[PDB]
């Protein structure tokens, strides 16, 4: 595989997201780290799929709603950023006010 | 498209060109297999291999570097040798020369 | 006897005339020369050539090399040849034919009992990369960079502080001393840059005397003509380099005023295209001058479909700008221009831009300098075809032109070329072994000072080192004292004389910079073009000799999704 | 010109009169003062104030600070004010107005070419915490503690051995020497405690001469009146501190006998509430004496619904007790009393208990000292309202009273207040930057000795340091020699005189303890109450002046599930 | 008073006559002796024995031990007894009865204020393992090995280079110096082997003078009679050991010729069974000679259902052989013989093979030396029953015979037995604490030089060290300077005299090898059998005194799937 | 649990495999690291199940086909090796040309 440090670091993000994904499934209101991990993981898979940065900057705001997260959480996340390998190399996706 | 693929041009490579060679018939008189390397001083191989050791003095196998010739018990075969170069000084092996020649 | 070419390549790697594809790109190299004597190649393993009295001699340690890289395919600015590489005393001893002079012909690299062996047959060997635009935002960058194939890092910073987030300045004697001490812990060669934004010379001299090998003039600290002139005056007297990030705001004047302040004195212009900073919108015109050594930062290399979309927000965070403050966002579309981004790629292919760097974590990606340089080369071959300098049916010249951008040129620019930058005898043995299929993406072996510092490693408890999971892990060359002995801390001639190394009790080997003032555009290997370039103030179009310079945005790139897990 | 208050706060952070909520608690602070001159605030970034000739001067390094924390909201025992913080030589230089005296008014903290910048606008800055009850069960505790905001750790141990599992004693000269050497590798200030349980003075003197800054009397090693008197005699002559864990079994006598043995001599009583150890069931009555400096361990802070259920088994494992041995379990309900646990919270709010600590991995959580202290403050405001000392409509006084518990007071108690404990000029620059929304939970920046030692860091290969995943990673201040230069190893005056540092070849900066014998309850900042407290032998009820002291168990707490992944 | 045996075992561990099962194997040990005085056992914890004036004395540090392991069940080549272990100055002080001479009878190990305590009641304590066949392919091997219970590692290499992949040779002065420096960073005792494949003595002498404690003759570098004789001549004059990997190809002669070249001189034969290398197919006959010290590598231990299937490809990768080259694969079935693999297990049970090793990442598993040795013992008891030397209804003798294989014997073979190898007074305190249920699989505590270097550790932030997740983490004994003080770098007498340690500026404690030439088969503890063994050239059958030696392949083994997550 | 370094290292392999498994599920053509992780994880579970080394050396070549992976990927993996605890201890499984 020859995993570089950055690839191993993203495995931490992926795994953190597996935790959030399962809790949301049980019908829990996600907390701060769970929300960030869940939305971040979403974007990475979007890039793997070949979606453009522009599309993800939009879609990332429709992963979780204000009623699916704990109080105060939406305001604790003015934005979310994550990079991934798109078909045209690594790119940065910035999602402003992801939770509404 | 194959990442890192080679595009080797067709043909052959002539090895150890311009050097003295000689053919020798060798027979394995031992009960166990014996494998000889490309750069081993043939005149000093396992004593179980019977051949004209005198002729193979200062020679090695005329095969591509890194390969070998195996001799199963009782096997007999003719091999081609190529003379050592450089200083033509043999050191090591069975310690039969330990010097020039 | 005789062996077919194919079987030969499978055993010892390609030879003269054979071509090799670089990773999954369209770039093909062709072996220009082979220094071996057919039939006399050295090989290691059970029953192979490198054995006592055979491929190994009886000489003492002083008469043989410490390490030999057998059957290597060297790719350097000077040639693409096949040879054995000899390493002695942590430095490159020779490039030739290895073996035992007792029985083999033409041996120039003697192998004895004191010789270790690295099998490079079928691999490409290159010099370690040199990134001259590092922001020391975190120590983890060194490993990331080392894994990618970069063995020397030049820049500055004190950690995750605002100043370092935006600039590469290691502010003052105290922080400089602190970072020099911290450098002994990193497995890469290091040289620091101080804050050159001051109009009082003594404030700069102290920093140089403290240990920095250069000074950065950054607009965030005020890139005024007064500061620029001051930094260049001190640089001229202390033989250190100046790196510039000009006045994007045109607050003190336009590009022509900055150029006027420089006054034909040697200077390295950072991210000359402008996206990363510089007079809007024509800082790119700097590459036309003889005293300017221009480089690019990697996020704009090469021009792709998502380049623009990504930059808008990246800029803000880096330079501490406020998206609500009109004036802070107004200079976004002024700094991010599709026009210059597209042109930059071509200017690189033409040799107008001589260096590539990262600009680590401040509008740049530390582990993608080599990767993106090759992506540019690929996209340029695809769009423009063979270079006017190409000979034969290969991309050999284009490969030499581009490899020089992150190797020898960065070294010449910062006065360290006497120590690193290329595979030449006498230089430190910072080498990288690549498998052709992973060239520029994931290294097989990274050698520092003659010791492997990092490499992919499988199951530690396995019966062999190949079983999964295989990922990069630190090796002996990156351990304590062995590390100190295999890395270099570059100091300014003044710092070396002042005894800074002894006072700070630095443990690593020391190297001194020199020749920073004498280098000019014409010295940049394969990248000395001084084009008559212009930029339209309104349309931002870039023109050379009146002709329009531009390129198309890539939708898919090689060395991307086929290699990375994320 | 003019700017609205809201826009002003968004740019430079809150000013006089503005209130800020602490994390998700009910505690609100109000800016008491602002040291700036409106319109002259320094800000860093592209086109901002801190630039050559503007907010940055022409002075030499000796005439300006090395680091400046701009627009910080300081929260310390002495005040809650807005100011710039200047750091020079690894120590706090000044708290005032930063800038360039050449063009700005009232500059007390000069910024020059040698000055690094940390943007603190909108952040809360505090002194690093000090935990005086560490069991060195594992080296990993230092990082965990540093991440939470604690920069100094006092305790003892040799690793995961039975003795250290239960006590904080670093037994004898050999282990003391070994741990002092191992301390150079840790990014926190450290001071060791030796085993004070002996009735032969010379056995204690050796340990103090070996390097310990205190001695712990623990019942597991026999907390007899003879041992107590012995330790206090040596402490009195060597100016070191004694930490007590009394005889829970009442084997040698009751609390009044232990107090009698102490004989009005200065002593720090560990986990004074008793759950963690001490005369059953009235060790809590110790807080009424002038010579007693009482602290709490964190598992009982604050009283919640699950507190009791959890303790029963935690106690056993820590002290190597046997759940099958009747006598070993009999003293469970004797050591775990709902009555004292509830009272402890109130006694803290009243200033009867002066310190909070962890008791790391031995009935305590190393990364939750700060977090739990604030949870107590929250629960107390909720249940008891404003303190009699409050002024205005804020919790400013309660905030100063509680922050002192894990900062200045622990420092006064162990004779290290001259070096750390608060944001005061001359003290080591151990600071923690907090975002108001994560105050007391997750720090934005942790500074040690003037260098960032740890902070949250995103994708190392990203174009900026903000992309996910963001988690805590070691910085330059925690690297090799830079670390040594930014941390302190506290020695006893005797050890310092004996040349212990030179003999063990310690690499870090050395500090010496002093003033351990002269401190008394009245010296504890904002926590000097000596209540007339009694405990009912049968019912375990705690009473002060006859009135019943108690509180209700919390079902949900702030700084909990909203911040943690697990 | 009186206490039942069962209750007694539950409190202080088993006593004389009680038996204990080793992990999940069929091996049972029986306590042969107990050095305690019933009713006077020392125990630590709240209200226990080790307290001032009781089980703890008033003596000064010089008159008591630094560490005491209470109620330990010692399993060593000399006995299986119950006792307290005293550790002083990093070395084993005594094996006896610990306590306070003031009030207790028969105290030989005094406990005072300077004494730390490790509770070993109910645990098995053994000496740290010694692996004499390490390939330094990566630094991560040290941790893996330490976690398994091996505290000393002998071998060579420079990292992931071809030479080290196949051999354990640290080629020449430069690499030797580099590895000696890098060794200070590893938490295990280390000794290096140089490349002994040369026919010029001075080339070997330089290496020995450089610091190696042995020389390896490997067929990959040419194991010719000339080289063998040369290495043995130098070994004889410099008192260092020679490790052999003979000529599998029979290129220079058969096994009898190699034996002839050895000329009755002391030599350690690596993987004597042959799968890992050696004259095909009879290298195993070497174990019949008095001057031969034979060892096994672990992949062939013990003979199981999947042994053969796995070896075919493992061999290729290790020795850089080509699966397409007929001659390279032809010697696969010649090196991998079911016949010798099955016999090897029996020869171990008989004491014909005296050592077990790994051959780390080159046809061996670094973390499975101890684990596989016990699996062999289990399979042998199952198939052959009790040994002729057994007494009583236990496997005590078989346990002593097998533990000696990876402890005292490897130490005698390499001239380091004066420092490590067994639990004897005066030797370095390298001990491993095991819970009977995890014996040989996962250690409870690993002690190096008197300090815990690694152990399982739970939640760092937990209230106790037991909460999940529990996994192995580095402890204080593995930290910076404490590590240096607790580990040994073994040098050759020549290197020590030359001042190599001072020149390379080695920080760890130095030990010198001696007695490598004088050891012979008869000195191998419990493994001195010199059988009249023969191997059939055609059928490969192994015979001792004409009788056929063989065993059956195991389908399921203990210490496997019940303990490992993967 | 007392996880040793080798057990923790294999958790990285397992997790890398969870990523690949999910992407394959979406119908994506797997890349180089995804393919290696997926096939490796398969073999480890085979060992846990008690399958023999010989069986796995065969079955491992039928996990992914040439049409389920990106171009060039099959040639980038001449073999795959991974060790796991079989009922008879740790063993090495070498799968030659796993993708056809």
Q: CATH homologous superfamily of the largest domain in chain C - what is it?
A: Metal-dependent hydrolases
CATH class of the largest domain in chain C, named Alpha Beta
In CATH terms, what is the fold-level topology of the largest domain in chain C?
A: TIM Barrel
The value of Rg of chain C in angstroms is 24 Å
Helix percentage range of chain C? 10-25%
Give the count of helical stretches of chain C. Answer: 16
Give the beta-strand count of chain C: 28
The structure class of chain C reads: alpha/beta
What CATH first level of chain B would be assigned? Mainly Beta
Which series of helices and strands of chain B comes N to C? Answer: EEEEEEEEEE
The CATH topology of chain B comes to Urease, subunit B
Intertermini distance of chain B: 53 Å
- Percent range of helical residues of chain B: under 10%
Q: From the alpha-carbon coordinates, what is the Rg of chain B to the nearest angstrom?
A: 16 Å
CATH superfamily of chain B: Urease, beta subunit
Shape of chain C: globular
Biggest β-sheet strands, sense, barrel of chain B: 4 strands, antiparallel
PDB class: hydrolase
Keywords: hydrolase (urea amido), mutant, nickel metalloenzyme, hydrolase
Entry title: K217E variant of klebsiella aerogenes urease
Chains A, F: urease (gamma subunit)
Describe the fold and architecture.
It is classed as hydrolase. The entry lists the keywords hydrolase (urea amido), mutant, nickel metalloenzyme, hydrolase. The entry is titled "K217E variant of klebsiella aerogenes urease". Chains A, F: urease (gamma subunit). The organism of A, F is Klebsiella aerogenes. EC number of A, F: 3.5.1.5. The structure is cut from a larger assembly and holds two copies of chain A (100 residues), one copy of chain B (101 residues) and three copies of chain C (566 residues). Chain A is of the alpha+beta class and 100 residues long. Chain A has a single domain, classed as Urease, subunit A, CATH 3.30.280.10. Chain A is built from three helices and two strands. Chain A has a two-stranded antiparallel ribbon with strand order 1-2. In chain A, a hairpin with a 2-residue loop joins strand 1 (79-86) and strand 2. In chain A, helix 1 crosses helix 2. The longest helix of chain A has 21 residues, at 5-25. Chain B is mainly β. Chain B is 0% helix and 38% strand. Chain B has no helices and ten strands. In chain B, the strands form three sheets. Chain B has a four-stranded antiparallel beta sheet, with no helix packed on it. Chain C is of the alpha/beta class. Chain C folds into two domains: 1-127 and 422-479, Urease, subunit C, domain 1 (Roll), CATH 2.30.40; 128-421 and 480-566, Metal-dependent hydrolases (TIM Barrel). Chain C has 16 helices and 28 strands. In chain C, the strands form five sheets. In chain C, strands 4, 5, 6, 7, 10, 11, 20, 21, 22 and 23 form a ten-stranded mixed beta sheet that branches. In chain C, strands 12, 13, 14, 15, 16, 17, 18, 19, 24 and 25 form a ten-stranded parallel beta sheet that branches. In chain C, strand 26 (533-535) and strand 27 (542-544) form a beta hairpin. In chain C, helix 4 packs parallel to helix 5 and helix 6 packs parallel to helix 7 (255-262). The longest helix of chain C is centred in the middle third of the chain and has 16 residues, at 369-384. Chain C is globular. Chains in contact: A-C, A-D, A-F, B-C, B-E, B-F, C-D, C-E, C-F, D-E, E-F. Chain E binds chain F through residues 140, 143-144, 147-148, 304-306, 309-310, 313-314, 365, 367-368, 371-372, 375, 438, 442, 456, 468-472, 554-557, 559-561, 564-566, and chain F through 1-8, 10-11, 14, 44, 48, 52-54, 57, 81, 84-94. Strand 2 (12-14) of chain B pairs antiparallel with strand 1 (2-4) of chain C.
């Amino acid at each position: 595989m020859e995993l570089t440090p950055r690839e191993k670091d993203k495995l931490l993000l992926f795994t953190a997201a597996l935790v959030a994904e399962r809790r949301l499934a049980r019908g829990l209101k996600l907390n701060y780290p769970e929300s960030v991990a869940l939305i971040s993981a979403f974007i990475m898979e979007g890039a793997r799929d070949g979606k453009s940065v522009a599309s993800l900057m939009e879609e990332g705001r429709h992963v979780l709603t204000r009623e699916q997260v704990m109080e105060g959480v939406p305001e604790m996340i003015p934005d979310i950023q994550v990079e991934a390998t798109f078909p045209d190399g690594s790119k940065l996706v910035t999602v402003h006010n992801p939770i509404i | 498209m194959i990442p890192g693929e080679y595009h080797v041009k067709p043909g052959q490579i002539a090895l150890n060109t311009g050097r003295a060679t000689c053919r020798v018939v060798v027979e394995n008189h031992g009960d166990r297999p014996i494998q000889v390397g490309s750069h081993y001083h043939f005149a000093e191989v396992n004593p179980a291999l019977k051949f004209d050791r005198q002729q193979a003095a200062g020679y090695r196998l005329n095969i591509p570097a890194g390969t070998a010739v195996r001799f199963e018990p009782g096997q007999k075969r003719e091999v081609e040798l190529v003379a050592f170069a450089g200083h033509r000084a043999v050191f090591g092996f069975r310690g039969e020369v330990m010097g020039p020649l | 006897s005789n062996i077919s070419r194919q079987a030969y390549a499978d055993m010892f790697g390609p030879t003269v005339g054979d071509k090799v594809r670089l990773a999954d790109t369209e770039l093909w190299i062709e072996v220009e020369d082979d220094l071996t004597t057919y039939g006399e190649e050295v090989k290691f393993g059970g029953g192979k050539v490198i054995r006592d009295g055979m491929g190994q001699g009886q000489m003492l340690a002083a008469d043989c090399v410490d390490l030999v890289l057998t059957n290597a395919l060297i790719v350097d600015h000077w040639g693409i040849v096949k040879a054995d590489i000899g390493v002695k005393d942590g430095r490159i001893f020779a490039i030739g034919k290895a073996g035992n002079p007792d029985i083999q012909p033409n041996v120039t690299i003697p192998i004895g009992a004191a010789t270790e062996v690295i099998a490079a047959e079928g691999k490409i060997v290159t010099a370690g990369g040199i990134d001259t635009h590092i922001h020391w935002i975190c120590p983890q960058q060194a490993e990331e960079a080392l894994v990618s194939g970069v063995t020397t890092m030049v820049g500055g910073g004190t950690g995750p502080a605002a100043g370092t987030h935006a600039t590469t300045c290691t502010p003052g004697p105290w922080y400089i001393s602190r970072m020099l001490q911290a450098a002994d812990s990193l497995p890469v060669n290091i040289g620091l840059l101080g804050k050159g934004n001051v109009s009082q010379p003594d404030a700069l001299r102290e920093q140089v005397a403290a240990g920095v090998i250069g000074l950065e003039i950054h607009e965030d600290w005020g890139a005024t003509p007064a500061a620029i002139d001051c930094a260049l005056t001190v640089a001229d007297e202390m033989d250190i380099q100046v790196a510039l990030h000009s006045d994007t705001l045109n607050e003190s004047g336009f590009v022509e005023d900055t150029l006027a302040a420089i006054g034909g004195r040697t200077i390295h212009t950072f991210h000359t295209e402008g996206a990363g900073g510089g007079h809007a919108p024509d800082i790119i015109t700097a590459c036309a001058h003889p005293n300017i050594l221009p480089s690019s930062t990697n996020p704009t290399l090469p021009y792709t479909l998502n380049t623009i979309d990504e930059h808008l927000d990246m800029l803000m965070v880096c330079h501490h700008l406020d998206p609500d403050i009109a004036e802070d966002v107004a200079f976004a579309e002024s700094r991010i221009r599709r026009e210059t981004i597209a042109a930059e790629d071509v200017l690189h292919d033409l040799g107008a831009f001589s260096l590539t760097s990262s600009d680590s974590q401040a509008m740049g990606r530390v582990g993608e300098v080599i990767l993106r340089t090759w992506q540019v080369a690929h996209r340029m071959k695809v769009q423009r075809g063979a270079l006017a300098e190409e000979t034969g049916d290969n991309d050999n010249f284009r490969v030499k032109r581009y490899i020089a951008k992150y190797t020898i040129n960065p070294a010449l620019t910062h006065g360290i070329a006497h120590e690193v930058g290329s595979i030449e005898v006498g230089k430190l043995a910072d080498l990288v072994v690549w498998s052709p299929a992973f060239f520029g993406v994931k290294p097989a072996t990274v050698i520092k000072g003659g010791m492997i510092a990092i490499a992919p490693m499988g199951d530690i408890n396995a019966s062999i080192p190949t079983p999964q999971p295989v990922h990069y892990r630190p090796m002996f060359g990156a351990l304590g004292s062995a590390r100190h002995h295999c890395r270099l801390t570059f100091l300014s001639q003044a710092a070396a004389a002042n005894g800074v190394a002894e006072r700070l009790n630095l443990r690593s080997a020391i190297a001194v910079v020199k020749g920073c003032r004498t280098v000019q555009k014409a010295d940049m290997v394969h990248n000395s073009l001084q084009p008559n370039i212009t930029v339209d103030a309104q349309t931002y179009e870039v023109r050379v000799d009146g002709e329009l310079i531009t390129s198309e945005p890539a939708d898919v790139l090689p060395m991307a999704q086929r290699y990375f897990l994320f």
